[PDB]
Amino acid sequence: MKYMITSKGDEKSDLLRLNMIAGFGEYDMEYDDVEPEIVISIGGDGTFLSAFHQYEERLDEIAFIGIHTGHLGFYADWRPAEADKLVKLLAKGEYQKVSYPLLKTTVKYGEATYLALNESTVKSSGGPFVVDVVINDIHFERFRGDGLCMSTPSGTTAYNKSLGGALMHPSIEAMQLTEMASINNRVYRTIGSPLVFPKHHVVSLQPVNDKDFQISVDHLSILHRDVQEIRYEVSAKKIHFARFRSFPFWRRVHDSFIE
Amino acid sequence: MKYMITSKGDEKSDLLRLNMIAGFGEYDMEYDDVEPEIVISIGGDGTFLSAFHQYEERLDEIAFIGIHTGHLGFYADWRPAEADKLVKLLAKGEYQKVSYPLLKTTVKYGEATYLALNESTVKSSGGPFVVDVVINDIHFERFRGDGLCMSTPSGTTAYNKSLGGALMHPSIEAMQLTEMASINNRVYRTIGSPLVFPKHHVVSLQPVNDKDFQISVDHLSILHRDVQEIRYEVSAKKIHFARFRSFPFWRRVHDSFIE
Amino acid sequence: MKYMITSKGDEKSDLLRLNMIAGFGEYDMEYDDVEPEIVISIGGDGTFLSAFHQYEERLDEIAFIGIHTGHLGFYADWRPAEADKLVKLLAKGEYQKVSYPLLKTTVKYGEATYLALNESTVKSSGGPFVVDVVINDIHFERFRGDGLCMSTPSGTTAYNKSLGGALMHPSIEAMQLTEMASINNRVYRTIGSPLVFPKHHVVSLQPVNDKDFQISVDHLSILHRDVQEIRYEVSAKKIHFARFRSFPFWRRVHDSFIE
Amino acid sequence: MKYMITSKGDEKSDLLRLNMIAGFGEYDMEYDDVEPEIVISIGGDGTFLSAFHQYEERLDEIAFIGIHTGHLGFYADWRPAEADKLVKLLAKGEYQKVSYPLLKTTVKYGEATYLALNESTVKSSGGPFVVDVVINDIHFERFRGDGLCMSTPSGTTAYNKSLGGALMHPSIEAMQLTEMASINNRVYRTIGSPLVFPKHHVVSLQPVNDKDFQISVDHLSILHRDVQEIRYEVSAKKIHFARFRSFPFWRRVHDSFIE
């Protein structure tokens, strides 16, 4: 089975990577980083994030796995001491696949599409940030503040959580919008609460004055110029995970934030 | 078609009720408050809440409608001037049915089940409130504060919203838990963020010291004694609405909070 | 020097109390719980709270001290192993006095005054809670929600903190009001932010419909009937602490919440 | 009396400015923008902000006034129709002076000091933002998030309010720190609550990895490189306002946010 392994780059991860390659070397397991079926990431959730974007083109052909050499990550939920258990279980299968929803981000000018595993945010380049929020072609509010954040279900535990958003189970195919330091007075008015949109709901951001935005998708962030509208909706593509055990989402939330 | 009409009790509502009964009196429309198929509520969302609980037994046999004689309610979303339009459209049908999820609340002692349209809350009778939160038979946290609130999707715009929870579209079959003034220090630790649970997820509250709780379901609130566990999960029953127009949920959110 | 010692009542505290009485028995130290000059509390901050209210009449004649037999309290900031150090330093003095502001609460009917070290809260007895907030005889807002909380500076780390309020240094003679789950829509409007009032500013709560309120002062909470107005203002009396060391307020905040 | 008038630059403001200059032209009132005693700003609070920074050198020699040609500002609290009332009352005096606290910001490298009327914020240039927060030379926390904000009392109604901070009366000589989207998990830990520091308390921010920060003071924001520490403390200088009427701070808060 075609596979590849990305590493965080430090001593702990590169050496654990060479051990698994030697472990797979005892099986009928071909290494390939062009068209792999199993993508293993070793490091942290940030390392897993780059592994997902490296192969965002053939998501349906890949099952992702993550080893955390630091603390317990949400996508990297395998201890290094369990790596040899992993190599043996990958050899044939009998494992199952688990799929999480994704977020499609479309940006039109005078058109680029992105796929986000965690979240996508919008901020203003330099000056004030004012956008008209449009939900299913109906004007909902005029936002003035620092920015907005649209999050995937599994991405709610990251930036979405720091902004007051709700943590939602990844079996729910939905997206969640949150606000950043919005102004609310007798002039400007925002909803304030986080909003959870289902499949087939389109959230569109339209500029009011300035047309340049600092848009981010996960940990890649590039300034866009002459933006006409930013379009958010739950993607039709899903990321596929290889499951060998029973690690519930709420147990991962408990271990990361409670204890 | 069997129907009944509840009124808020004031001058504006009782007179609008007698007009619709006379309007239905010109059609093949039988009045019945024992086994109606169409339940019309005139007043506010609180009046709609009592209309739902009056007939929570045969929810699948009923389609609810609401007229707001005050401000725009979320369940009562028909202007009084549109009442004659309503009477004519009820006469034959051609309308469609729209269903929202509900919340089942089970209370065991040393067992009562409830159905909630908005939310169900738990508080302590007098003294401190300490409960162990159990998600799918796994201990998640020990809550110490004022109380907890489990909300339906359509109920997120009410008490759930005042507690910082997210507003989620009612097409999502889910429930949302929020916290009330929880203590978080170097001793006690709660998640803080709101939690959104899908279907078939069971949230269970277990007492630590005191066993008496002030439990509420919508606007009915009764003290319970010798409680063993409180069990929350998305109900299998759904409330059915009669739709004649296109009033999206986000448009109702906009009119109630933005403008 | 006249002194008395209250204990939490458990094994750890009563035995530490008898040791200090024997320690003071070797000095010119008279025990008196009628008119003491040094009030020592052994247990937790709740034990200190009762010690303060036991002698709220002669606050200016007393210097309070607190030993924490559990975790680090904010008022009980002496380890039990440092009790013998305490007994020796109390013997003559050379210690200094540190004063914190207090909160006066006046309740008028058709008049009772209270002194609060932590906070004073207002809630509704059973039904909805609606009060008109009046600041310096000027109407500021109409609050509809669960309740309000007026906190002392040193009391900001308690209930005030759980409600989102700011932690303010106790050298600032001020009070802080916070809200509990307020309703904000296109009908009702509250400020939302916590408010910090200086000396000589009077905050007055006036009923709108119901006239019965569940009013609390620290950990004593009694239902009041036929209430005309609740009046909050920074008290002119101050609680006096005996200081022997340098334990800054921000260091106490750090040890309790950070580590 | 030496005076000058800045204008927002639009039609409404420049024409109201020329009327007041002609109004002062009938009195013994000399126009001077080098060393004025009365600085009049016409426009919004942002126009007042630039008027303050234009003359931040001789604050003790100046009394500021503000006319709002748009909506009710907090510093610009005079209606344009009351401009002729203003010109007459400035002619001799009989008015009184009202002083507000300020925020001193010191930035050391391998030293620049600033004066802020609203707030001063810190953010990271590009990458993650990690700073060690030091209060009175004692380490308090390690902050990881989007940034921090230190606000003046009168500046609490601006950016400080959007971040959840408390609105505090400007008669209190203090500063308030608030957090922006901080990460809190089983690894990183921040206090979360806003902190209110009195006079003579020094808050110091120290870098952990990156040493470049985007620092702002009111509406001027410049990237700093090779930063050793950022030092916040309540300034010894105060801004002086000319008062002719009784417009309480809480009445200004009410008119801006409630109604």
Ligand SMILES: CCn1c(C)nc2c(N)ncnc21
């Ligand atoms: C900042 C580290 N991190 C990343 C890269 N993804 C996540 C995530 N889903 N939840 C929590 N923390 C996360």
Ligand SMILES: CCn1c(C)nc2c(N)ncnc21
């Ligand atoms: C307090 C009035 N009210 C009721 C009874 N239900 C709701 C609701 N779903 N959303 C908003 N307000 C509501």
Ligand SMILES: CCn1c(C)nc2c(N)ncnc21
């Ligand atoms: C609930 C325990 N507790 C009491 C009784 N006072 C306090 C206080 N000022 N800060 C924190 N916790 C406190």
Ligand SMILES: CCn1c(C)nc2c(N)ncnc21
């Ligand atoms: C953004 C407009 N604005 C300025 C420039 N100062 C303030 C202030 N103190 N309170 C509210 N709004 C403000």
